[PDB]
Design a protein around this nucleic acid. Structure first.
Lengths: 93, 89, 119, 103, 43
RNA sequence: GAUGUUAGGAGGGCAAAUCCGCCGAAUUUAAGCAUAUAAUUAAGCGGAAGAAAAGAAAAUAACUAUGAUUCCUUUAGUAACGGCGAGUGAACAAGGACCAGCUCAAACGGUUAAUCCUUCGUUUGGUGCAAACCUUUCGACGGAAUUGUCGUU
RNA sequence: UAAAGCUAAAUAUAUGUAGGAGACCGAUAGCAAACAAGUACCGUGAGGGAAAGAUGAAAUAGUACUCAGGAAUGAGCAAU
RNA sequence: ACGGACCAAGGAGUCUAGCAAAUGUGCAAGUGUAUAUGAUUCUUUAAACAUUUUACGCAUAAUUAAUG
RNA sequence: UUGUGUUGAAGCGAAAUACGUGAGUUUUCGUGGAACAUCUCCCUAGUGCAGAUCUUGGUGGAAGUAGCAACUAUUCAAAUGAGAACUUUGAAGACUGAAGUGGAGAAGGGUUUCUUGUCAACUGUGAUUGAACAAGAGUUAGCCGCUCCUAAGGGAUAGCUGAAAAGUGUUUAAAGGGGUCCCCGUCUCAAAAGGGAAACAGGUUGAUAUUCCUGUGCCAAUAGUAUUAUGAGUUAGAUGGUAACAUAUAUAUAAAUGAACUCCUUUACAUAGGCUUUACACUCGGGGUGCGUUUUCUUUGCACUUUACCU
RNA sequence: UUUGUUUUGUAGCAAUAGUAAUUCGUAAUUAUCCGAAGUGGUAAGGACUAUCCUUGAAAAAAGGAGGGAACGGCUUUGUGCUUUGCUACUCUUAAUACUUGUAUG
RNA sequence: AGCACAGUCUUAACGAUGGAUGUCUUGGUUCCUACAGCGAUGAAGGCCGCAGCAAAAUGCGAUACGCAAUGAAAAUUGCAGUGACUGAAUCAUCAGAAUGCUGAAUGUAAACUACACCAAUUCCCUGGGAAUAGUGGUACUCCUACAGAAA
């Protein structure tokens, strides 16, 4: 069986849904230089690292993930000290 | 005693014997003997019985989506050749 | 909002590029929706449908150009070959069902059923 | 009437042997050319208690003849045999306590 | 309990999601509602 | 015989009203009950089709004879079975619906397997916008087959 | 003329789908279900299994305004 | 002696097979046209209409285990 | 067949100088707002209720009654609020009494958690409360667990039975690995208390912490080539001690040749009894610091005076 | 290069952290965190003694040993081996560079 | 501004409670007719998802209350929004494309989103240029052909 349609594996658009802007997420940005993202459940640490790297010119220090009760994955992404986490947050909103 | 026949013994009601049964999705999968009480999931067949018309009719075909047969219906009346498309404007 | 006929003439390269940029714009719209911004929330449907349209065109082009690759060759992959009912696939061919031995063939040829009338 | 207690024993549900801590079946050496036409001496490395039975067992080490190595046997110990003793098995084994001879 | 399987946790999340009320704007044109203490979902 | 992630294929499960095999009760009736009846039923297991199954006489008759199967009217609640009790119970002929006959084995063919399949090619024309499809006979290759394919009756 | 085989029609269809009907039922009836019904809910489980239709022609007429009340509401010389 | 706190709605000799009697009707040593067929019938009509001068049931004859 | 209806049908409530003997029939008023009758004759049936501890639904007297009784116990003032015995704050009197309504977990639950609102119903009195209702939010791990191993044992394969369904599980198995021809060898599941690579302290939120932050560590893995550098060893594998045994301290004790084939050890194990050591706990005295009593006495009573993993 | 005598350090972690205090705009400064003991409650360890017609899991995984298969480097003859000419070489940890699919968790 | 005893029972009028009755009916029931298998090309069934605001039901499958195509063809609307002056808004048809995880379920497992082995894989341009830990395959039994081993 050969497949003609282009692959429907999850790429960046779909792997990373949107940033989280709750009070906790917003507080984390200035203090601990970290960004909170909502991702599809099928993502993993490597997927999220590569996705943020190639979606925004940001280099990851570490990723922590959790599965919410709303059917998605919340990812705390700590940015390296080379580039601060506030101007990138301003850049994307 | 205090865990007597009724209310006392009912206090020790934890540790269910049945769970979700990935095939039926119904909480009837006997955990100890690894076998669904509703469909017998490890076995290949469906575990139907003619002495329960109710049970037959609450899980027969057409109870669910019929994701494919409902599409293949009416092709008997259309009789289109596969790969054919309507002639364009 | 793009229709399905004008992009039917594009090559696969710019078809995929259009899909990519359209997905990027949809992602931006979803980011705005997740934020407090809500003015643009109604364009999500249109962008989503545009993505569906360009994907449809690209997949149809790919499938047709794949069929052109297995033109004849008698050994197409299973998805390329026919998808009739299973028993229709396993049915004897009409030629096989109509096949007959030489003995009965010559019997039928020499004494066919005849048309006639009566007084 | 109902099935009586003696009948239920053959079903082997709760009447199976409590054998969790048994050390193994007590058997002599399998017949071999050495045992048929000579003596083979095994060293009784240890004597142990098998929880099922009353007779102690003997962990006896023989040296394999077909290949380099040592084989282990569990033999019901005879009264008077001691660790570090060599017992001979076979037709030509001398008649002494602990030896295995043809009758 | 605190320790759960992935499928059980997703089922719990789905059951929580289905417990929300009908949207008001839709009401301009629900009965399958449960409370955690009255009716146990048993699943 | 093994073994092969060798090449190409098939089976598995669902669904049952009708259909085909198996297995198989008791309630009930007999005013009790044991044979009998319920019933060659229900439950259980397996297997198909748009129908299935049966079907082209090792048939019936006893006549001035009929002529595969199935079904309808009837034979007929009859012949018969049965603590000859309760109960059970066909067939032939007759009138109709429909109507269809055939092939293996065995025989015969050795101045010649005359057969079959796989794979790779060639064209004979056609309906399709396309996708695809229907016809086509000249091969070549590799096999199967004399432990028997094909032709004749 | 047994111990091998094929075979259409007339035949049956409490199933599924699609049509058409009726001296049928008319919301305690008719399918269990006219409705979000094999749903809610019950049982460890096999399974068990409901209740619940009707404003008006038109809510593209669903009660504006005032008074009294914290509010619910009530009242009106006000109102569809 | 048992059932009945009250009210509304629902609530029980019916359907089919087969036999007889009774009565009405048609025809009468005959009666019934079965299945099926035809026919400018095909909303109704799934009913009505029809049946080239030894189909079948019952009756027209009884009796006997029975050849009769 | 022949009639009644928006100039109001059916139904319903009350009735009638009404008819009948009676089931009933027929009329009036009111309500109702869309259908209804046929008694001209006949056809048809799921056709007539007081009961069946009848079925379903609704409603009574009992009755503002029984009752709202374990868990010693509340009081004063203030805030909020329309409203405070049971919301909040302060004061007091008491309770639980480390075998705790104190902290952690498992099973089970599943968002009850947090914040902000909020009171239709519920919170058997009230209620502004709440585990109720509404909108948002919240669960971060190489080191905690699962995941791995095997146990009681389960399923399955080969067979062999059985019509099958199923029953048993090596009963004539030619059944993956290893080195390099031979050797070993059914598979799989079953422990969140058994076995087991490796983490501590301080801090941080409204809600998470051995998970986040800071700092300090530890475990496992790290392919091939080539360079360097670190150490050893050697003109093919080191050395001391009589011995028990010891030695590589490089950032880092990394290297002390070693195949096939073997033999061991650890993992790895009951109970009872006392003796002993250590850590933690408790307690005593001194020093310092702060607080309290202070009519009288009191060199006084109380609190703090700490130090993790790793090396 | 050995033996006796002082100082320092809570042995490093470590005081920079905690704790209890005194002040200062409202985020900072300061001082303390050290001299001895008793009871035996809990937990673990040790060395033992005793009991059994009761002897009180396994495997994954890891380690030790016995044994002694294989043997430098540069160049060359001849069909891995004999050979000629020269000696500075083999292991181990770490880092870097390139290749390897993207070479930590 | 004054007068009735109270309670209990009866009657009438008007109302509360209740949901009978009548009238409705996109439902059922029965009969007649016609067609009739779906699945390793992965079925039925089960999960999980999908809308701007979206719980259920209905619909759909990462192209996710719908894509393309064909016929009709101006609306669609709660708001927001989208539509021509007809491949556009909405219906209908539905042949193309797509069709998540499962399930006979079939690599090993299963109260695990656990673990294998073999090909690395996919895409773009007309031999290059990229991106990807991603993608396929691997069950048991059997048939036909083939392979090299066996006596």
């Amino acid at each position: 069986i050969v497949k003609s349609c282009h692959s429907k594996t999850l790429d960046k658009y779909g792997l990373i849904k949107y940033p989280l802007t709750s009070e906790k997420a917003m507080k984390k940005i200035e203090e601990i230089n970290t960004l909170v993202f909502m991702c599809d459940k099928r993502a993993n640490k490597k997927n999220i690292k590569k996705s943020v790297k190639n979606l925004f010119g940001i280099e990851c220090d570490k990723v922590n993930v959790l599965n919410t009760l709303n059917g998605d994955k919340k990812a705390y992404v700590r940015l390296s000290g080379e580039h601060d986490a506030l101007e990138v947050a301003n850049k994307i909103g | 005693g205090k865990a007597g026949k009724g209310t006392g013994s009912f206090g020790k009601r934890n540790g269910k014997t049945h769970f979700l049964c990935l095939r039926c999705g119904k909480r009837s999968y006997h955990l100890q003997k690894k076998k669904c009480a509703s469909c017998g999931y490890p076995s290949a067949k469906k575990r139907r019985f003619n002495w329960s018309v109710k049970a037959k009719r609450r899980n027969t075909t057409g109870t669910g989506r019929c994701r494919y047969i409902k599409t293949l219906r009416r092709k008997l009346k259309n009789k289109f050749t596969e790969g054919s498309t309507p002639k364009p404007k | 909002n793009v229709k399905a006929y004008e992009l039917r003439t594009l090559k696969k390269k710019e078809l995929l590029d259009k899909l990519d940029e359209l997905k990027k714009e949809l992602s931006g719209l979803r980011i705005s929706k997740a934020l407090g911004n809500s003015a643009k929330n109604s364009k999500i449907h249109g962008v989503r449908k545009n993505v569906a349209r360009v994907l449809t065109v690209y997949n149809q082009k790919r499938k047709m150009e794949l069929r052109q690759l297995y033109k004849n060759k008698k050994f197409k992959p299973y998805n390329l070959r026919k998808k009739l009912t299973k028993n229709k696939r396993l049915q004897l061919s009409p030629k096989q069902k109509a096949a007959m031995t030489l003995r009965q063939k010559k019997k039928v040829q020499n004494f066919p059923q005849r048309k006639y009338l009566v007084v | 009437g109902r099935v009586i207690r003696g009948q239920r024993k053959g079903r082997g549900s709760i009447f199976k042997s409590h054998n969790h801590h048994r050390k193994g079946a007590a058997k002599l050496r399998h017949l071999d050319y050495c045992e048929k036409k000579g003596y083979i001496k095994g060293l009784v490395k240890d004597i142990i208690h098998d929880p099922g039975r009353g007779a102690p067992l003997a962990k006896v080490i023989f040296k394999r003849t077909e290949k380099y190595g040592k084989k282990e046997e569990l033999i019901i110990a005879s009264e008077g045999m001691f660790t570090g003793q060599y017992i001979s098995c076979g037709t030509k084994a001398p008649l002494s306590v602990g030896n295995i001879l043809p009758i | 309990g605190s320790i759960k399987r992935f499928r059980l946790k997703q089922r719990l999340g789905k059951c929580r999601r289905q417990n929300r009320p009908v949207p008001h704007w839709y009401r301009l044109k629900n009965t399958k509602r449960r409370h955690w203490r009255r009716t146990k979902l048993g699943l």
